[PDB]
Amino acid sequence: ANFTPSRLGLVNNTGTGVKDLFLKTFAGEVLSAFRKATIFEDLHTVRTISSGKS
Amino acid sequence: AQFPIVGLSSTSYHSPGTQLTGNAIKHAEAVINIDDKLVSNVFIADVDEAMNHYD
């Protein structure tokens, strides 16, 4: 301990929190709810029609 | 829009020595106010469009 640093995150020279002049930043990854296992979309017969009600 | 209309006259005998004054031919007009806007509209859903077999 031989130096007196210039704390550039302090609001003045008369504080305790050496942070709080810095910013909170986006991490880069956004979380979201998981996708439930859809096992019945497959394992059945699928057909497509172009017109009609049944 | 306004349509003016004209037409009248008269005929009489004259006595010498007197001055003719005149006879008035007065007019009128016909006006045609413009009505509101006529419309005709319809709404077609896409369910019926998809379930149909003609346009």
Single out the residue of B28, B31, B26 nearest to residue B2, CA to CA: B31
Q: Which residues contact B2 (CB under 8 A, 6 or more apart)?
A: B29, B30, B31
A 10 A CB-CB count for B33 gives 5
User: Which residues of chain B lie closer than 8 angstroms to A51, CB-CB?
Assistant: 50-53
Resolution (A): 3.2
Cα(B49)–Cα(A51) distance, integer angstroms: 9
Q: In this complex, do A52 and B51 lie within 8 Å of one another by their Cβ atoms?
A: yes
List the helix and strand counts (H, then E) for chain B: 1, 2
Q: Which of A48, A49, A50, A51 to mutate to test the interface with B (most CBs of B within 10 A)?
A: A51
The CA distance from B40 to the nearest CA of chain A, in Å, is 29
Which are the contacts of B28, defined by CB distance < 8 A and separation ≥ 6? Answer: B4, B5
